Write a protein that binds this ligand. Structure first.
Ligand SMILES: Cc1cn([C@@H]2O[C@H](CSCCCCNCc3cccnc3C(C)(C)C)[C@@H](O)[C@H]2O)c2ncnc(N)c12
Length: 616
């Protein structure tokens, strides 16, 4: 996509409460005398229009992004405020007086905050603003400089959350007959990306508070000296008592943002708010079980942009292998590995049963999975197998050589691998291909790789998976609608933004965590498509699917996922609880009213790795 608008813009603009408190704070500050305003990171320009409507004499809005800047120019002009608001395509750090802005401003308004508060560089931007773009602070509001937000209190809480854990810690020491040795320590990219961002009010499986909430930091955005002192401030060593028995999985962080002395915003987890929380995963501990009487220790600092929580330990009453969170979720996906072990054993049993646990001829197995994979080690433990790994990273090879060694493989049993024959005049008995992206879409050129792979197979040899079924269902989801499009002008307090920003939406929502999404089912899930790697003649380009509507409702989306068939009996589900793949959905531009008992027709168009789903 050439012209992107980030998904969080739709969610935020749809949050009437957020828009109300920001407009209330700006109205109060403008009416009190702050007549010259600078909006840092204007987005659509909503805070600038609030300032001008409140009665500001001069409004300047700066926007880093070319796309957001151009959109903001059109929104402001459509709201008849072209003459009153001056939009600037620049980062606020590059603004010079009188070159870009003629005079120092009395009020800075900004929303350049993330779940961890500091992740968008609010400190660096406000230090530059106080030094070069703002009037002197208070010792009449027109005479002195002020910032919205005024201040913040940052909170933390130790939690048990199995959903976070399966993405940052490998939770088992034995997978599908293979041992994962102690001398190989797996760690996520958050180990020392200090935190991920999560909607903890709806996290799959939920979370449990193991401690009470605690203050981790405070910051005064109107205090330049306090802001400059952050770069060299020594970390704050804190000790938190444990109030509940449980597995320590993360420190969940949120903040209370004080816009002024009357108006405050909380990012505390709630299904009533749009705000996500900062999640600091707990890893590299000897024991994760914590009980009342224990103390959770950590070091909180904010010297180089991001808020950091380091040296996490529990105070009572070896090769390191960095993996992506998708690869850790993969190692924690037991049905995937057990399914692959059983499917590989059946191929070995049908082709060479004496090899299952020419004597010089091994059963050749190629794993073309993308990223870290242990499938070649599982294959090697099964029989007289010559397995090949496609890992690129040197650290991954070392780890796999140590895993191979722990599974009694003599040196160079496992080898590291364009699709070609194992050896000139030799054929593969098993080829594993990566068909579904973690995004929930089909991998690019998979049909082409399958066609090339089929020519390299021994008679009776198999490509894994053999075929993939795409499943989908009709849903009424107001949540998917509000994360895809701004719902009117009432949400944006009379301002016309929705028609202009809604144009930058994409038809397919990827990386969807379907189980955490509030949905009303309007149909039962049904097979939409068959992607056959062993028998492409069974594929269909153009198909109409008649979906029985079980329940009357407003159809807003068609979520979809897959059943990957390793053979006729063994299938993997990309929507399963332990799945390391995310799902996806076709979200409708205009929701359709459907009635119980009708057969809705979906048009499913398949060309190579593309699938188009529309209501016919
Ligand atoms: C530093 C800077 C940024 N920019 C521009 O402004 C925006 C930066 S902010 C990034 C998104 C923040 C959303 N945070 C919401 C949130 C918070 C907490 C919890 N949950 C959320 C949810 C769940 C809702 C995402 C962006 O348009 C940039 O191009 C600037 N332009 C001019 N000069 C500058 N110095 C800047």
């Amino acid at each position: 996509a050439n012209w992107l608008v980030e998904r969080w813009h739709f969610i935020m603009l749809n949050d009437t409460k957020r828009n109300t408190i920001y407009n209330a704070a700006i109205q109060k500050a403008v009416c009190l005398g702050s007549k010259s305003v600078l909006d840092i990171g204007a987005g659509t320009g909503i805070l600038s229009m609030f300032a001008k409507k409140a009665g500001a004499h001069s409004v300047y809005a700066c926007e880093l992004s070319k796309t957001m800047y151009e959109l903001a120019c059109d929104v402001v002009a459509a709201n008849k405020m072209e003459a009153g608001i001056k939009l600037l395509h620049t980062k606020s750090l590059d603004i010079e007086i009188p070159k870009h802005i003629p005079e120092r401003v009395s009020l800075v308004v900004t929303e350049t905050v993330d779940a961890g508060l500091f992740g968008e560089g609010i400190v660096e931007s406000l230090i530059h603003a106080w030094e070069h773009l703002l009037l002197q602070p208070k010792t009449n509001c027109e005479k002195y400089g002020k910032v919205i937000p005024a201040s913040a209190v940052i909170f933390g809480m130790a939690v048990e959350c199995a959903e976070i854990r399966r993405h940052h810690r490998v939770g088992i020491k034995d997978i599908a007959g293979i041992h994962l040795p102690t001398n190989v320590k797996f760690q996520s990219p958050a180990y020392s990306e200090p935190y991920t961002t999560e909607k903890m009010s709806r996290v799959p499986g939920g979370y449990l508070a193991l401690t009470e909430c605690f203050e981790i930091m405070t910051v005064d955005f109107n205090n330049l000296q306090e802001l400059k002192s952050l770069a060299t401030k020594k970390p704050d060593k804190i000790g938190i008592p444990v109030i509940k028995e449980g597995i320590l999985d993360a420190i969940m962080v949120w903040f209370v943002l004080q816009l002024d002395d009357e108006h405050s915003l909380s990012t505390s987890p709630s299904e009533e708010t749009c705000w996500e929380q900062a999640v600091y995963p707990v890893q590299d501990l000897a024991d994760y079980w914590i009980k009342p009487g224990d103390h959770v220790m950590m070091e909180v600092s904010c010297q180089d942009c991001y808020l950091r929580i380091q040296s996490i330990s529990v105070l009572g009453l070896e090769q390191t292998c960095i993996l992506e969170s998708t690869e850790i979720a993969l190692l924690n996906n037991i049905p995937y590995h057990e399914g692959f072990k059983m499917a590989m054993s059946k191929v070995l049993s049908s082709l060479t049963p004496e090899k299952l646990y020419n004597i010089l001829e091994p059963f050749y197995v190629l794993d073309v999975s993308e990223g870290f994979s242990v499938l070649p080690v599982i294959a090697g433990t099964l029989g007289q197998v010559k397995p090949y790994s496609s890992v690129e990273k040197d650290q991954h090879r070392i780890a796999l050589d140590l895993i191979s060694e722990a599974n009694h493989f003599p040196k160079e049993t496992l080898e590291f691998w364009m699709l070609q024959r194992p050896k000139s005049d030799k054929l593969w008995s098993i080829i594993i291909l990566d068909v579904i992206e973690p995004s929930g879409l089909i991998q690019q050129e998979i049909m082409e790789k399958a066609a090339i792979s089929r020519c390299l197979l021994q008679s009776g040899g198999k490509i894994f998976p053999q075929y993939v079924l795409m499943f989908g269902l009709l849903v009424e989801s107001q949540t998917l609608l509000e994360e895809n499009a701004v719902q009117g002008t009432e949400r944006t307090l009379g301002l016309n933004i929705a028609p202009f920003i809604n144009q930058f939406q994409v038809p397919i929502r990827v990386f969807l965590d379907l189980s955490s999404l509030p949905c009303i089912p309007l149909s039962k899930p049904v097979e939409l498509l068959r992607l056959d790697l062993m028998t492409p003649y069974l594929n269909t380009s153009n198909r109409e699917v008649k979906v029985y509507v079980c329940k009357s409702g407003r159809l807003t989306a068609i979520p979809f996922w897959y059943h990957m068939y390793l053979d006729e009996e063994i299938r993997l589900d990309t929507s399963s609880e332990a799945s390391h793949w995310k799902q996806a959905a076709v979200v409708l531009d205009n929701p359709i009213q459907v009635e119980m008992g009708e057969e809705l027709v979906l048009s499913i168009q398949h060309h190579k790795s593309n699938v188009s789903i529309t209501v016919k």
